[PDB]
Amino acid sequence: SMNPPPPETSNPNKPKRQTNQLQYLLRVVLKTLWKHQFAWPFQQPVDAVKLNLPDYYKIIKTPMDMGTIKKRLENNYYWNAQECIQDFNTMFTNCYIYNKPGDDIVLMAEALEKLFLQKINELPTEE
Ligand SMILES: COc1ccc(CCc2nc3cc(-c4c(C)noc4C)ccc3n2C[C@H](C)N2CCOCC2)cc1Cl
Numbered sequence: 001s002m003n004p005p006p007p008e009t010s011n012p013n014k015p016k017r018q019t020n021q022l023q024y025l026l027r028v029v030l031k032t033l034w035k036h037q038f039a040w041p042f043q044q045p046v047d048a049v050k051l052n053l054p055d056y057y058k059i060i061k062t063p064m065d066m067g068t069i070k071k072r073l074e075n076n077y078y079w080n081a082q083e084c085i086q087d088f089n090t091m092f093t094n095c096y097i098y099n100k101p102g103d104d105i106v107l108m109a110e111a112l113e114k115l116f117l118q119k120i121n122e123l124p125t126e127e
Helices: 020-032 065-076 083-099 106-122
Strands: none
Touching: 020 065, 020 083, 020 106, 065 083, 083 106
């Protein structure tokens, strides 16, 4: 099996805006996770071909990763902060669905998710 194409990251047919919350999601939330020592396997779509995981995309139908999230933020793809928060949650949940507790990748996701929740608890005020 091939990989699927990556998630869309730019769409000129969607209106665009900058907001305090979206800026914070890029500058604080995404940055903090991106620079973390456990970021690597979450920095791009799961490459099921290279990883030899023929069932990955049989199981995970809503893939998401931080590379995609970073590009979406940079390209003003999200209008509301909750759209971006949902993408992070999808990323973590996919890891937990596909893998097993105690797997090294799950321990890494759990560490990143803890930091994510910490930073989201300090979202700035809405316009
Ligand atoms: C430039 O070369 C690379 C670039 C990216 C990757 C992907 C890394 C990766 N991407 C990964 C993605 C997952 C993953 C995730 C995330 N959710 O389910 C699974 C399975 C789990 C592990 C992942 N891993 C770690 C893999 C297996 N091994 C890489 C070689 O060193 C030992 C570790 C690999 C290589 Cl060799």
